[PDB]
Structure formats: C-alpha cells, structure tokens
C-alpha cells in the first residue's frame, strides 16, 4: 500500500482522514517495513510548506488522538517558523481557534482526564503563539487568563499549566531558542505582570478545596520560585503556608518540600530571620511525620515510591539548608537542639541502601568535615568553638564512614577487538568518586581525632574475630576502611595500630577453617599491608617476609589468589622500589639479585598476563638503581628468558620465514612483546639496551607479518580479519608499535633517538603501511608517529617530508570519500597532522605548495565531520596554524591572500549548521582571531586583487554577501547588524559566542519585513558599548 500511503502528499483533493489515521496507527502499531514506510510518509507530509492549512480538518474529523497530535505538530512548526510572514487575518484566526479549543477541552473533566496529552500540546502551541506575539500584539493576555481562571476550577488548573509552561519557556529554556534582546524583553514583560498571577496562586492555595487544582498551583509555584523577586518569597506568608497547610498533607509532601528546598537554596543576607524560621518550623513539622526513632533503613527498603521520593527530597533539603545556613543556625544558642535533630535525621537517612541518597548525604558530611578541619587541623585537646558543637555526633559520622566504606578498585574483564580478555582498572568512574569522597571524609575526621577512629576500627575487628559479626563483606569493608586512613596518623601511632590489626588478622586466619575463608583473610591482610608503605619501608624483615609470602601465593591455584599476589607485589614494588636495589643490614646481596636469580621458579604457575604484571613489578625495582653499569647488568639479567625465547624464534626463522605463519610462534612473539612493553614502561630510558638489542629483528618480523596479513586480506577479502591467525599477527604488529612508541615517550635524548631508532621506521613501518591494501593498514602507525613527533619535535623536522610522502596521500585518499568509514584512521591521521603542525611547523615550508594546499584542504575536511573528536582536532589544528602563520610576517601575507577568504567561508559554512553547535566555542575563537587580525591591520596586503580597498570594508561586504546569498530570507538590516557585531565583539569571546547563537536562532525563522523582534536600536547600543570598552582597553 505504498502508493496509498504516499497519496497523502498530493495536495490536490481534500485530505483523507481515514488514510492518515491508518498510516499513523501503522507508525505507532507497526511491526516491520510498514512502520518505516509510515514514518517516512508522515515525515515528508510534516515538512511540506502550506500543509498547515489541512490541520483545521484533522482536528475536526479525526477521532484517533495520535493524528490530532500530528496536526498539532504541523501547526506548531508553522507557528515557530513562519508566523511573521502570515497575514494578520490568518494569525488572528489561528490564535482564536487555538484559544477556543483550549477553553472547550479544558472545561470538561472527562476530556482532560482522558487525553492529558492533546491538552498539553494545545498549551504548548499557545505558549509558542505567546512567545511570537504576546506583549506587542496581545497586551491583556495575563489579565484575561487570570480573569478567566475565576470561572472554573478546571479552567484554573489548565491556566496554571499554561503559566508554568510560559515561565519555563521564557526563563529556563530560553538560551539557544530566543535571541538575547527578545529573551530580555520577555523576561521584563513577565516580571512586570507577575504581581497578578501571584494573587491567583495565593487565592487557590488558601480557598480551593480541589486536590488536583491545588497540586497544579504548587507545581507551578515550584517553577516560579526559580526567578521571581525575593520580595514575593520572604515578605509574605508563602513559607508558613507551605509548611503548615501542605507539608503535612501526604499528597502535597513532595512538591511542598521541593518548594522549601528551592527557597532554602537562596543565599542572601537581607533575609536571615526568615531562614531561621524556615528551619525551626520545618523541623517541628518534620518530627511529627518522621519520628526520630524511625528505622528509615528498613522502612525505605519496603515502601511506596512516594515515600522513597520524600526521603530523597528530605535529604536534598537538609543538605542544601545546612550547607547554606549552618552559620546562622549555629549562632543562635536556643536552636542547638534543632540542629542536633537535623543532624540526627541526616544520620538516619545515611543508612538507606540507595546510592544517590547516600551520595547526597555524603557530600554534606564531607563539607562539614572539611570545614571543621580547616578551622583547626589539630587533634582535640581547648577546642575550637565551632568544633565543640559537633563533638557529640562526630563519632557517629566516623562509625558511618567505617561501616559503609566503598570498594577502592574497580576491575572489569574486557575483550578487545582481537578477542583478548584483559583486566582493566576503571579509573574515574562514579564508584571511584564515591570511595574517594568517603576516604577524604574519614581522613579529615581521623585528623580531628585519631583515637576515636582507632577505637572504632579495633571494636569492629574484635567483633569480626569473635564471630558475632563475621562475614566476608563486613571484613572487606573493615579492611578498606583501615587502608583508607593510611598516612593520617603519626608514624608511631600508625606502627602500633598496624601491629595490632595485623596480629589480630593473622590470629583470625588460622581460626577460620576452609580454603576460601583463609584466602579472603590473606587477601585482606595483603591489601592492608600494601596500603601502608611507610611501615614496610621502616622495617626490612617484615617487608622481606611479605614479599616472600606473596611469592608463595603465586603458586596458589585457588581463584583470585594469584591476582591478589600480583597486585600487592606491584604496589609494594612501586612504593618501596629503593629498598630492593640497595644492600640492607644483615643482607650480603640486594634483594633484586635474589629475585632475578630464581625467577623461573616464581612465575612457573602464573598465567601470561600475571607474568607480565610480575615483570613490570620487577622492572619498577630496576629503575631505582642509580648506578649505570649495575643497572645495565640488572637489565641484561632481567631480560634473560624473553631474550632466550626471542633468539630461538629468530634463529629458527632465519632458516625459513615460513615458521612465522605458525600460530604457536606468533603467540610466543606476542607474549614476548607484551613482556617487553611492560618492562619498558616500568624501567624507562635505561631500557635502550634491550630495545637496541631487539629493534631490527622486531622491525623485520613486523614487516613479514604485515605482508602476510595484506596478502591474506587481498586474496580472501576482509572477512579473514576475524581468523585466529590474522588476529595473532595484528596483535604482534600492535605490540611492536606500542613498544616503540612507549620507549620513545620515555627517552631522554632526542638527538640519539632521531639518529638511531627513527630512520629504520621509515623503511620498515611507513613504506610498508603505504604498500598495504586499505583494509590491511594499521591505524596505530599514524598514532605512533604522532607520539614520536610530540617527543623529538625539532629534531625530526628534517624527515617530515618522508613521513608525509609515505602516509599522507594514502590515508587522505582513504578517508576523503565520506565521513563514516575508517574512524580510527581519521582520528589518528588528524592527531598526526596536529602533532606536525604544533611541533614541526617549518616542515610545511619545505613541502611543495600543492602539498600545503592538500594539508589545508584536509584540515578543512576535519572540522566538517559530525564526529566530535575529529572536528575538535580539526578546529585546534586550524587555530594553531593561523597562530603559527601570524608569527612569520614574511609568508603571512601570501598565506592570507591565498586562504583567508576560503577559511572564513568554510568556518561560516560550519557555523550556520545545527550539526556543529557542539564546537561553537572554537568557532567563536577562530573567527574572532581572524576578524581581530584584520581590525589591527595585520593583513597589510589588500585581500581584493581587483583594487586596493580597506580590508575592514571588503570583509564586511564579503561576509554580508556570503550570508545573504546562503540565507536569502534574512533582512539586510539584521545581516548588517550581525557583521557589525562580528567586527565589534572580536575581543570578547563569550559575547562573540552569544552573537553566533543569536544568529543561529535568527536564520531558523522567516521575519519577512517585521522589525518588532529585531530590536535594532538596543543591539546597536550594546555593540557600541562593547566597542567603546574594547577601545578603552
């Protein structure tokens, strides 16, 4: 029925309501291609100009409510876009029709109850008509709507909904949808007439007995509280009415508490007794509904959604009001009990097992702890006056923090594109933030009083050993709490506390039976030990015993024991790396020598990734050896087994290169390269011995594997990339690149690197990249070079032409057909281009002019992407290129004459596009820098070859013609105003960005020949003031 569906677009005969209803139902109740067909037909019908004329029929005949919504969508689009060009008679007709519909459907309870969506759409259409026409041509809207609100309660409810929608669209969601002048005009007009739409709310809240009406009035008051003058809040009886008439009513609790939270967030000095009475009255009204002896934990766990929302709103209110006016509450002596009860409520709500509520409570707890610490960071004795208030309840906060401690680490098993499962440690997630906040709060509290925290932890540990509270999660929480306060005690107090804790935990380890319980206890002991490196550094026998015990756990096949051992060992190696290389008292040799001598017996039972972790940990101990020859000997002995395997494989391959196709040897190569990458990361520059030992063999194997992969993909298609052998080869290539880039990132001799390690790459990696088929090329090659260019910088500027001849042409031809395929290549190519531009700009003076034109075209192609990262990189590259060219006044004039107009045209092409608004800030900078660069007369040569004319005039004419021809519906006056603003606000980036947003808003609507919304005078005065301020500077 495709022809039947598409018949709707004929616009030749009367609309067929049956067909429209059928297609709409198919859209909302379709299974497959029918749904897409209906969607496409409806979208095409919606975007047809002059289709709004049919709406008056859709709303009169169609019975389905989803088609009337569609007609309202069409009407709303027309009202938003082309209101100013419709004749006055049609505008009046639409206005009267919409108002009549609103009055008709809002006066019958049945329809309002049933639909609830058609009415909302009508209200939104009326709000759009108001924004278009309210104050200028509708002077008495507020008087009439408020006057009409006295005729019925249903009408009053709908009018309240309309008023809140208007308030939202004028004050809350105005930025980006209304020009600054028009938004300010609307705000002033609404603030002037608000004294009348506030008597209505007061009357309804004090005389109405209709629950939905009063609830709607409160819901709109909640929105009005965002912007109304404070006089309407604190100089009337609004707070008292909210506290006593609606807070206690179960069906008005949530909205009333939201209103009180909005009021409590106001920080002003003129009103401080009203905040004081906002607290005492609220608290007295709160302990009659939430008794202090209530177990909010259990009650919340099994409760209705309304009660849970109330608990969250109460936490928000208490947090906000305390954070704001704790000083005011504390100053009054007779309010001490109320403050203590508010803190008791905060403590009760902190027990609820909801993450969001706990975060809301924890931010206030952290605020209070930080304030008390900043008052005086010394332990309690006199005592600071403000700390004495909270002394009776600080141990409760300490107990709460110790009891609900969050997990420090977040480990996730993830498989990459090559099917290699690895453990990733999420770093900056929400859980890590929660743990960090809890740790900070507990550290502050421990600084305030360490004895109490030690007592709490000791009591909990005792409750664990006796078994009355034993549990795996409880012990884990206790040990995380113990480890979170590392460094918050003096050295001797910490030593005694650690001795006690570790002795008790060891005593409990033998007591508990079973392998799992012992494994948990040992894991907790090792976690605690690894979190106190100062204790380990102080005492050598204990550190050596701990390291030996960790080595013993590496032969444990129980799940999670070897991983724990490796994590603890790497932590201890990082923190205490200097106690292994040096000879200790009673030791004839350094411990690192002992570890290296018997290393095959330690990693025998480890899995490959655990072996990599162990090699990294040992590497962290070899970078701490300052002596050069000793460190060289350690590195040579530290890389003995991988070197043996690598030499075996290379010697075998020398006989015949066909072995490299064997999957087992490729797996061995990948593992060896991963080990080398980890060791390089751990050691740093001194790893040059190993790197130069294996460099050329690594490059040759890389080239062989790359050729094999390219041949396979060429002869079998891109499907082969998912085979195990191709995956292994790609893994080997990526590990080779990672090793090279990682070492270069940590070298300390750019000249030596450029002279030795770079030249081989050009023949081995770059020309190989060029020779590969597009589907077999490694994007990482483009990133590795970036990491090199960011490091060697001026030392690699002589080889940029070779790198470009190798990669630039092929990559650009690969990624210049669309904006979708090859995302990694796009990202890395533009990162490499950015690196070259930032660090090796003079290389652009050596490439031919044609290649520079290609580079600039690629930069322009960068910021036309819909991918945010690529577009951002392109904008950064363009800004940096302009700045670099500005410095060299010799070729700056030629560059300007050649590309200034083109760059300006493309920037304006992407600015006036709604798909690039995310980059607007950069657009504000670049454009400004350009226009300023012409207002200061930096472009000495005339940009117009036709005749010598002032640049500031030629540019104005050029931009005006550019914008007028692209958007012919714009008036000349507003285009000229926009160009003047461009040339005036060029030294105020936020104002420039607001100017751009205003223009984006303007280009969306057809103003015809109406100047009622342009406000040319006000904006011209604003631009003149901005220019004067710029001149004064």
């Amino acid at each position: 029925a495709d022809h039947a569906a598409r018949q709707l677009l004929d616009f030749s005969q009367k609309l067929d309501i049956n067909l429209l209803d059928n297609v709409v139902n198919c859209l909302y109740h379709g299974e497959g291609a029918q749904q897409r067909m209906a969607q496409e037909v409806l979208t095409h019908l919606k975007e047809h100009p002059d289709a709004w004329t049919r709406v008056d029929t859709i709303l009169e005949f169609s019975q389905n409510m989803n088609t009337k919504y569609y007609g309202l969508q069409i009407l709303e689009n027309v009202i938003k876009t082309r209101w100013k060009i419709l004749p006055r008679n049609q505008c009046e007709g639409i206005k009267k029709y919409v108002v009549g519909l609103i009055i008709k459907t809002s006066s019958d309870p049945t329809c309002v109850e049933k639909e609830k969506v058609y009415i909302g759409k009508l209200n939104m259409i009326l709000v759009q008509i108001l924004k278009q026409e309210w104050p200028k041509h509708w002077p008495t809207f507020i008087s009439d709507i408020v006057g009409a609100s006295r005729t019925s309660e249903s009408l009053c409810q709908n009018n309240m909904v309309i008023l809140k929608l208007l308030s939202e669209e004028v004050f809350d969601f105005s930025s980006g949808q209304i020009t600054q002048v028009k938004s300010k005009h609307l705000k002033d007009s609404m603030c002037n007439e608000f004294s009348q739409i506030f008597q209505l709310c007061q009357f309804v809240m004090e005389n109405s007995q209709n629950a939905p009406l009063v609830h709607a009035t409160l819901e709109t008051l909640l929105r009005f509280l965002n912007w109304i003058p404070l006089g309407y809040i604190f100089e009337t009886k609004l707070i008292s009415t909210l506290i006593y008439k609606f807070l206690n009513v179960p069906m008005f609790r949530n909205v009333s508490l939201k209103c009180l939270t909005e009021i409590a967030g106001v920080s002003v000095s003129q009103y401080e007794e009203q905040f004081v009475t906002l607290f005492t009255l609220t608290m007295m009204q709160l302990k009659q509904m939430l008794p202090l002896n209530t177990n909010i934990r259990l009650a919340y766990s099994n409760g209705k959604d309304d009660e849970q929302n109330f608990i969250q709103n109460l936490s928000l209110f208490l947090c906000t009001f305390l954070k704001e006016h704790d000083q005011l509450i504390e100053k009054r002596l007779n309010l001490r009990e109320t403050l203590m009860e508010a803190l008791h409520y905060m403590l009760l709500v902190s027990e609820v097992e909801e993450t969001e509520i706990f975060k809301i409570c924890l931010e206030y707890w952290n605020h209070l702890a930080a304030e008390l610490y900043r008052e005086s960071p010394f332990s309690t004795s006199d005592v600071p006056p403000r700390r004495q208030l909270y002394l009776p309840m600080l141990f409760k906060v300490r107990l709460l923090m110790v009891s609900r401690m969050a997990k420090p680490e977040e480990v996730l098993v993830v498989e990459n594109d090559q099917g290699e499962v690895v453990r990733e440690f999420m770093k900056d997630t929400d859980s890590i933030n929660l743990y960090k906040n809890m740790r900070e709060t507990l550290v502050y509290l421990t600084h305030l009083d360490y004895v109490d925290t030690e007592r709490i932890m000791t009591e909990k540990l005792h409750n664990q050993v006796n078994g009355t509270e034993w549990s795996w999660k409880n012990l884990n929480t206790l040990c995380w709490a113990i480890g979170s306060i590392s460094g918050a005690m003096h050295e001797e107090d910490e030593k005694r506390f650690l001795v006690t804790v570790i002795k008790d935990l060891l005593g409990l380890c033998e007591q508990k039976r079973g392998k799992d319980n012992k494994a948990i206890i040992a894991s907790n002991i090792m976690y605690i030990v690894g979190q106190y490196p100062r204790f380990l550094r102080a005492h050598w026998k204990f550190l050596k015993t701990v390291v030996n015990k960790l080595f013993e756990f590496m032969h444990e096949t129980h799940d999670g024991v070897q991983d724990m051992a490796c994590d603890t060992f790497i932590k201890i190696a990082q923190k205490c790396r200097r106690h292994f290389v040096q000879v200790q008292v009673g030791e004839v040799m350094p411990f690192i020598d002992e570890i290296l001598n018997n290393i095959n017996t330690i990693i025998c039972d480890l899995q490959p990734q655990q072996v990599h972790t162990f090699y990294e940990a040992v590497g962290y101990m070899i970078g701490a050896q300052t002596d050069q020859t000793v460190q060289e000997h350690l590195i040579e002995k530290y890389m003995l087994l991988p070197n043996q395997v690598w030499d075996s494989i290379i010697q075998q391959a020398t006989k015949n290169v066909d072995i490299l196709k064997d999957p087992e040897t490729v797996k061995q190569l990948g593992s060896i390269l991963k080990t080398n990458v980890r060791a390089c990361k751990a050691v740093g520059h001194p790893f040059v011995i190993q790197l130069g030992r294996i460099y050329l063999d690594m490059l040759n194997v890389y080239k062989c594997l790359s050729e094999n992969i390219s041949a396979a993909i060429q002869a079998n298609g891109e499907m082969v990339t998912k085979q195990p052998l191709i995956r292994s080869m790609r893994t080997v290539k990526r590990e080779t690149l990672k090793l090279i880039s990682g070492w270069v990132s940590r070298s300390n001799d750019p000249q030596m690197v450029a002279e030795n390690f770079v030249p081989p790459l050009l023949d081995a990696v770059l020309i190989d990249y060029q020779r590969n088929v597009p589907a077999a090329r490694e994007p990482e090659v483009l990133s590795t070079m970036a990491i090199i260019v960011n490091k060697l910088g001026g030392h690699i500027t002589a080889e940029i032409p070779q790198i470009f001849d190798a990669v630039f042409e092929c990559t650009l031809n690969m990624i210049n057909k669309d904006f979708e395929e090859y995302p990694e290549h796009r990202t890395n190519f533009f990162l490499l281009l950015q690196a070259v531009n930032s660090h090796c700009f003079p290389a652009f003076l050596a490439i031919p002019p044609t290649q520079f034109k290609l580079v600039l075209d690629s930069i322009i192609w960068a910021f036309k992407h819909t991918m945010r990262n690529v577009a951002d990189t392109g904008l950064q590259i363009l800004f940096t290129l302009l700045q670099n060219v500005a410095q060299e006044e010799a070729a700056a004039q030629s560059f300007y004459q050649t590309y200034f107009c083109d760059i300006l045209q493309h920037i304006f092409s992407v600015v006036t596009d709604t798909s690039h608004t995310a980059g607007l800030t950069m657009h504000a900078s670049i454009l400004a820098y350009m226009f300023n660069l012409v207002e200061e007369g930096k472009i000495s040569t005339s940009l117009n070859p036709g005749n010598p004319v002032n640049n500031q005039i030629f540019l104005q004419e050029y931009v005006a013609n550019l914008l007028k021809s692209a958007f012919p519906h714009l008036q000349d006056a507003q285009v000229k105003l926009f160009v003047t603003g461009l040339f005036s606000l060029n030294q105020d980036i936020p104002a420039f960005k607001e100017h751009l947003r205003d223009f984006l808003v303007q280009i969306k609507e057809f103003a015809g020949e109406d100047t009622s919304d342009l406000f040319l005078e006000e904006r011209e005065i604003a631009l003149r003031q901005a220019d004067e301020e710029k001149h004064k500077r």
Binding site: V657, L696, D697, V701, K703
Partner: peptide, 11 residues
C-alpha cells in the same frame, strides 16, 4: 653499536 645488526633480514 646502539642498534645491533639484524640476524633475521626480511627481503
């Protein structure tokens, strides 16, 4: 030599 010669050379 900072970079050792290649035992395995891939033509």
């Amino acid at each position: 030599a900072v970079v050792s010669p290649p035992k395995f050379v891939f033509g």
